[PDB]
Amino acid sequence: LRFGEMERDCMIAHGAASFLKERLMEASDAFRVHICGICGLMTVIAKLNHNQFECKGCDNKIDIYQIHIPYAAKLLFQELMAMNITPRLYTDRSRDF
Amino acid sequence: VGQQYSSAPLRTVKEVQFGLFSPEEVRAISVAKIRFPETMDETQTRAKIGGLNDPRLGSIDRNLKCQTCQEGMNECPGHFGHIDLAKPVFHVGFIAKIKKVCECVCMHCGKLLLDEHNELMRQALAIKDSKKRFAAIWTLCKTKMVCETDVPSEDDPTQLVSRGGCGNTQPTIRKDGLKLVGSWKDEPELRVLSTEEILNIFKHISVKDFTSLGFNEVFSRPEWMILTCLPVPPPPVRPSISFNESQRGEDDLTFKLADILKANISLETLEHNGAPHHAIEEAESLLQFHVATYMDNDIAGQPQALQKSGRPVKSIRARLKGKEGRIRGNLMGKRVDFSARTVISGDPNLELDQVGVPKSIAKTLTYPEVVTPYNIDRLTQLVRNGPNEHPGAKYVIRDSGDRIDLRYSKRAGDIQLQYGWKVERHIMDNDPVLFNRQPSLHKMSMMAHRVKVIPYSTFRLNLSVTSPYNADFDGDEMNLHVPQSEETRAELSQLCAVPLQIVSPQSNKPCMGIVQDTLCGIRKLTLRDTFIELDQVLNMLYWVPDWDGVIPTPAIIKPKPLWSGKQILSVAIPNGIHLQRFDEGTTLLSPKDNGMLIIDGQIIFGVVEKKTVGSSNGGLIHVVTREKGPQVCAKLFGNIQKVVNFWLLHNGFSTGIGDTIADGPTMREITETIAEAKKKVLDVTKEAQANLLTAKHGMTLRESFEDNVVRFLNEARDKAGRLAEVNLKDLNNVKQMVMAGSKGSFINIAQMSACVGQQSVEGKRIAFGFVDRTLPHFSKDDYSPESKGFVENSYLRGLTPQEFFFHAMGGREGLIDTAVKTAETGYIQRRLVKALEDIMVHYDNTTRNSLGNVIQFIYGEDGMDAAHIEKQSLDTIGGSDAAFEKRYRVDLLNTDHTLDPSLLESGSEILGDLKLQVLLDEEYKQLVKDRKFLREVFVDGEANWPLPVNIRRIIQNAQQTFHIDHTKPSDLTIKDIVLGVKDLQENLLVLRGKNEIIQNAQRDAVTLFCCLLRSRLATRRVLQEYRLTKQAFDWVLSNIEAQFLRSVVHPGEMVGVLAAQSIGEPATQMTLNTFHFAGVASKKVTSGVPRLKEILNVAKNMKTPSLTVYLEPGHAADQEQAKLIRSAIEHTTLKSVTIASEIYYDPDPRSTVIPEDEEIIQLHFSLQQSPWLLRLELDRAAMNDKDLTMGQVGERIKQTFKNDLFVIWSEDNDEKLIIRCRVVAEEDHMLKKIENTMLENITLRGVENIERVVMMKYDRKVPSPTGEYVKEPEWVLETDGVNLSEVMTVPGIDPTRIYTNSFIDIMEVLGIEAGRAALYKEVYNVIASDGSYVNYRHMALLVDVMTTQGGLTSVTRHGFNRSNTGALMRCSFEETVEILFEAGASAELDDCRGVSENVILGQMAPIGTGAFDVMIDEESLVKYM
Amino acid sequence: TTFTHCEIHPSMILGVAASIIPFPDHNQSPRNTYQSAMGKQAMGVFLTN
Amino acid sequence: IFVYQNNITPSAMKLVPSIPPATIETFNEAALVVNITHHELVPKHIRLSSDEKRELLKRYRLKESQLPRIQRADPVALYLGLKRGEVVKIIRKSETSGRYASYRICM
Amino acid sequence: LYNAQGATIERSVTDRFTCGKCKEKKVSYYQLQTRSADHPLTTFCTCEACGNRWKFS
Amino acid sequence: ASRHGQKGTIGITYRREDMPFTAEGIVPDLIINPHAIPSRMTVAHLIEC
Amino acid sequence: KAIPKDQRATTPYMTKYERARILGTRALQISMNAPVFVDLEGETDPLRIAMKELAEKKIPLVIRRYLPDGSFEDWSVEELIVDL
Amino acid sequence: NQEDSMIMNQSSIDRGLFRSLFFRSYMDQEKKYGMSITETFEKPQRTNTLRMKHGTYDKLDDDGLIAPGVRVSGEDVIIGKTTPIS
DNA sequence: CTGCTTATCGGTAG
DNA sequence: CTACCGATAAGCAGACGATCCTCTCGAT
RNA sequence: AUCGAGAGGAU
Ligand SMILES: [Mg+2]
Ligand SMILES: [Zn+2]
Ligand SMILES: [Zn+2]
Ligand SMILES: [Zn+2]
Ligand SMILES: [Zn+2]
């Protein structure tokens, strides 16, 4: 059954945050992607057995992170790339505030 | 989750930098070179061709093959490819900015059109927002059309400093299709701008000339707004639909890339071949289409872009656009696992928090419990029982990485469990489950429960949890979600649980109660007339599961030992409970069993019903929750239920047509009273027909006939009701339900047994939809009740056709504003919901949004949880100076004002103590400062207000806890009290700062609560009114602090969402377009929903813009004085008083042709122009409503056209007033130019826009001389139209109390801080018309978000959705891909503290539970062994 | 009394569904509306074949 | 502080910001008849010394912009005559706790 | 003068009503409307003494 | 649902024994709640019966 | 930025959200075969064991409360007053 | 029987109150090709292409259909039909 | 049941 | 006594439209 | 199963 917006908006209200991550991951999309630390993108080729990564273009092989995002999110991030829009993914904040 | 461990580190997402794709980074990223527009078929061979999909991306066949990457299918995402373009392209949605940037730049040299040498440009270039900067820049660069060689310097206007190069003229750019057309200026040079040249100019714009516009040197270059190389989404982004082998059906986007690549090829087929020069670009506009249609399609250009079969085709955009879309329907609201749904049934044998789950659904859902020696003994026998009997499981997952499916698997019977494996077991008794009914717009709409597995295919719940979910059992269905982590399920029973959710936060009162059978029985059971005997009583006693195992001594012994109902129901009410009511005629010895007194979980007198046991604020449920706890209170429900049901189950209760048949005399006496009620109508129908009716201030004789008539039949029906009402005995089931609150209001009695009544449409009785009649069955002009739809019969008697039909009409009217209504109600609901969101109370008790902006400095102006609040009386603002002193004044120096020693043990040696009086004067000095102060807060004098910690009870408990007696003296000192109370006003912390600014704002949050305190905890009160002891007085103080501390709001609380719903919930209850003023036209005002739709949209033009003007303090009750100010505000035009404007040919301007004027000229001569006279007749009547005289009128016209229109006028004593004016080569045509000016452009006396000014007598309650709050009525004018800027400046009015329902104006004139107030008051009365009450906090919060920014940010697309929030938050609402585009177009950065961002990223959003970290202390673990 | 036409019988202003309701003129106006939206969700013998 | 009666030439009004450090204010006669701050609704705004301001931020841990803002030409703001960066300690009456303070930095 | 004064809100009051504000027996209402019949039907009163508004169902 | 939009679902089944019989000896096939009158105002239902 | 154990403002009372997560991540470890610092008087449910671990106040976890400028205050369940 | 729900005598339910039959109908065709390559009803069994369903096929006769007498329950097969496609 | 772009007027500048 | 910048008024455009749930039919 | 619509349940 759909966990609509209104249902999400009831959980936010209650304050139960972890549960909302559960209604969004382990019981739904729950995918796992590799991003290159430098040009935060969905490009890293992952040869999972030989433990080699690399990132042609932003030459890497070293600085590579692993994310736990919903599949649909991946789809959106890709669809946007297919529209020449680059959605970056960085695993550390430089800004502060 | 995602199969197979990966070496790379696990890290969450913190930032998201939006940008654009540079062709150079497109070619470095791609792995497939894409050049061919086919699919597979290397000539039919089952594979794929190295041209389109598969060129090195993702496969289909179930082949590891993905450039050695293996993985495949569900592990490898998608690899991108690129496609070289022969000619540059416009990005569909970047059209506007591409035009805007060209308009902002000059060609040939590529530079900003305006340097800093231009000063107006500096202010624009100073703006620290890439959005608004480029906004003010474009408004300046839209004028320029020349590349300026030399420009005025910073010194003198004869010398110029040089900057840019050659100055060619620049074109005016318009949009058409997907290209840009321009016109160089000497007759236009008309030519189209090529994508090839635009990029040549966009490459050549300086590195600093980027950033000045909203662009980035790195992430977003204006040259990458033009597509040179197009990236290509893999299969997962446009996946096929495979039917075995030799059957393929592919996605739409796939066809797009074919059509694009097929066009791009036909292009390069003309370049390297014999091209027809300018026949090429014919097919170049095709490549501009396909690449522009592959992204967006609902554009301005009409070509819809079909695929054969008439298929609009989903361009990437539509995939994301709200609802069903990728963002809203697929990211914010996913479909979920571990969920269920069936028909709900009520079950009066389960506890409140419980929910009967069908055995089947418990066999289907699972919970993954990790094996431990704590549960091995159980979890193993579960696995053994398999997934068929109830207590069992359906999976066992070893720590290796593979499941064991118990429904198969040769080793279901074998199986050794191990310490650390996850058994996936059935849902079991007493697990936590989130239970929910849609449409969900409450915290209550979602609550945790305790699964109690039962047979039969229904979900079962407790009657008394029906109103929060809003359920009946007529077929409703409900959703259930099952948590999966011990940490997650905890996050339910500690927040979402049902009992925890009893004190509704939105209306500061308990939302669940006792209803129907249990509530209608508890009345029948209570009446002293109800008695129970030995045998039955014992059953009832056993029925309560908390019964002390001791049967209470019978209220009656005498001949036969009988018990009373009250006596045993009190077995359900725990120990230590106190409840005082007193209804109307309630006297400690109620002669009617009114009200209620409960001491020590015992009924003493008073029948229990709704007021006591219902969701009422001052009731039994409220108390027990604050007094005993949520756990102890939920159990209370079950007790009252289990017992009352049991009795009722045996007593019986029914209803028949006999419960709606009144007396013989009573019925005739009704029909007689409707008889005199008809002749009362007839007479005031002849009155109106003989033209004898008075007009009423309420306008129109015909309108005042309707007013009169409705109010005669409505008056008649109602007193026809009170007849049958009373004729009904006490042994009348319908009347019995009316009393117990269980259902049925009195009108239901009235209509059924007495008289249906008058039906209405829009507000007035039925109309003449049949040309001077209602049904063809009546003659024309039958304006009497039965013709105009007054149903005289009672439902029991049965309507007649005309009645039946006219009743059907009045019935439909609702169904309609339940259809037109719900649509726009949910969209105002969702808007608020999305507008507030991220606003949460932080740990410094501030109130901030995701940005980090303060919104309230202390949540709801005091820092208190809304659930912990009650309507307690402020006794200090009420009463008279006479009563005040007779009450709060203790004078130890006065023989007649001292605490009688018969009170205090230490009172007789206190009479006179000068020292004690100095700390007994300071109690008064402050109690008076409290009064003076409060009367300036609540000017109404209203004393009852929402405040934490009910004291009446907290004191009444001390009254019966320590059994204090009013006979023997107290053991407190006066130093005990004054120095005690005071030492409490230093312990009631909210904020906790170390320094000045915090502790001086802290005093403020408490200020109000304390007045309540000094109000009750004063001397002459504590000793004389309640008799407290040193012990009990210390206990009360010890309590009050605590229960005030528990009343404080917790940092984490997501007030945003909470406050939103609380307004969108009753906004859903609101009746659309009712209009209780339709019928009395010309005095209509907007009400209900559309009125709110106005406010939430910061609406400029409004339907009813009234603005209320109060009078100057003194001259406020003077009638005539009121009609003098009236006549000075109302916009009175020459057009208002004019009757007829005539034009005469009067040739000799020395004697008038008209003999009714002869007397006029004699005077205006006694004391060369033109013959075309212009006569004007003014009405004496209108000319004296707005105090004017002929001279004043004439002097005004003569100074409009001034000394070139010969004007004259009569006096104020002639049978007819006249203004004759003449003019001074077609002069009959210039005498009409001026005919219109003498009307719609000439003011006499009044402010413009202020048409109609009505006077009304208001009631005002005011501090009387004697001190009491007394009814002093003033005169006040209302109005139609707004001109606050000027009406205020008028003399005679109070320019300090002027008000307008146009809050938006009261911003522009009185300053934003007043606008806020006005905005709130304007919201309140909209929600207060419905009869709905919302706690100040929820509204004030919405009100604040609309102001803080600076102006009046609307709660629509245009408003809050343009602000500086993260990209992904603003894109979850309305304008989606339209914001995403601009997001990357201006290199934006998403902070990711917003609820929506982390929800989109599927991570734990910093919200309540997640508003912090919890780390393991190394130096507190070492101590624990 | 200038009558031109008489009505065959008031009860005919009802439609099919509505006509099955007993004593509809004894029922609250909108009630009948509801009943005329369920009788077409019932289980009868819709035809003999 | 200059008080005009109907309106000044758009040229003369731009001989106003062009002499530091002395600012110049214009005012309409009609806009000064009644004192707005006397109105029932308008709380008394107070200007904070850049000391009390630099002291305020610290105690509420703010980054300036995070503060609620007042329009630069807000009637009350021009009554006090405010500048870009200055702050007002708007102290309003409250129906949930006697008094309630609030702050507004100038836009 | 009769023209200057405005509409007078006249509505038949019932003695079959309990009020919170002034607890008086002077309350008028207006049938309607939300969802008529099943479930039930709203019933919005008023106090012309006090101003409060509540609702039934 | 009866013929007056008075709907609702079986919330439990009792047998002839546990049902309330009349002196006659009869027992009902259906037992609806007295609260399904005042609120809705279906008087035809009472009369139909 | 690290506010020290002194100069402490934020409520000394353990907020529902904090507690509801403390019990959580504790009922978590308990289920993961971890050691228990309280006598389990015939108990089998982790959440029901952490609740006994709470009134005896023997949980080794520090809550890190953030204010909206970065800086934070570190609080142990040992220090926090569990009222409710 | 509270809030829109009612008690219904089980004994009368037994004796046959409000009993109702339920008739659902499943339908299918054999689809030809412009080059004579029709489908086929039958009781299938593995063999090279393999793709099937999980239910008990053994309730079918051979023609491809069940006999009216029989008794379907779970996810059983009610119509056996195959597509020969290269 | 309204925000942003365009034209037409009334004033001030060489 | 004409040249041209600036204010204002008036004319035409866009993007929203309850939550969830079950059925049936038709098509590259 | 993807896609378009129609019929119906809950406020
Ligand atoms: Mg329902
Ligand atoms: Zn990279
Ligand atoms: Zn791959
Ligand atoms: Zn140039
Ligand atoms: Zn009242």
Short mmCIF file of C-alpha atoms in Angstrom, two decimals, chain E residues 10-48:
data_model
loop_
_atom_site.label_atom_id
_atom_site.label_comp_id
_atom_site.label_asym_id
_atom_site.label_seq_id
_atom_site.Cartn_x
_atom_site.Cartn_y
_atom_site.Cartn_z
CA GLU E 10 -32.35 38.89 13.88
CA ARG E 11 -32.53 35.15 14.50
CA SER E 12 -34.90 33.10 16.64
CA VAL E 13 -33.16 31.97 19.82
CA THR E 14 -33.80 28.62 21.58
CA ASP E 15 -33.95 27.86 25.31
CA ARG E 16 -32.80 24.31 24.57
CA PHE E 17 -29.09 25.19 24.54
CA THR E 18 -26.22 25.44 26.99
CA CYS E 19 -23.54 28.03 26.40
CA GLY E 20 -19.98 28.08 27.70
CA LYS E 21 -19.27 31.81 27.76
CA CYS E 22 -22.39 33.16 29.49
CA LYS E 23 -24.10 29.79 30.02
CA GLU E 24 -27.31 31.52 28.99
CA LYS E 25 -30.33 30.14 27.18
CA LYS E 26 -29.97 32.43 24.14
CA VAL E 27 -28.51 30.45 21.23
CA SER E 28 -29.45 30.46 17.54
CA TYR E 29 -28.15 28.03 14.94
CA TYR E 30 -28.31 27.05 11.27
CA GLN E 31 -28.79 23.52 9.94
CA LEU E 32 -25.92 22.29 7.76
CA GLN E 33 -23.94 21.04 6.29
CA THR E 34 -20.64 19.24 5.71
CA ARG E 35 -21.80 15.66 5.15
CA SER E 36 -25.58 15.36 5.46
CA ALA E 37 -26.98 12.07 6.76
CA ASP E 38 -24.78 8.97 6.86
CA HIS E 39 -22.64 9.57 8.52
CA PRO E 40 -24.73 12.37 10.03
CA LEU E 41 -25.07 16.14 9.61
CA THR E 42 -23.39 19.17 11.18
CA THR E 43 -25.38 21.63 13.27
CA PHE E 44 -23.74 25.03 13.86
CA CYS E 45 -25.06 27.18 16.64
CA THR E 46 -24.08 30.64 17.88
CA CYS E 47 -24.24 32.89 20.90
CA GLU E 48 -25.56 36.35 20.14
#
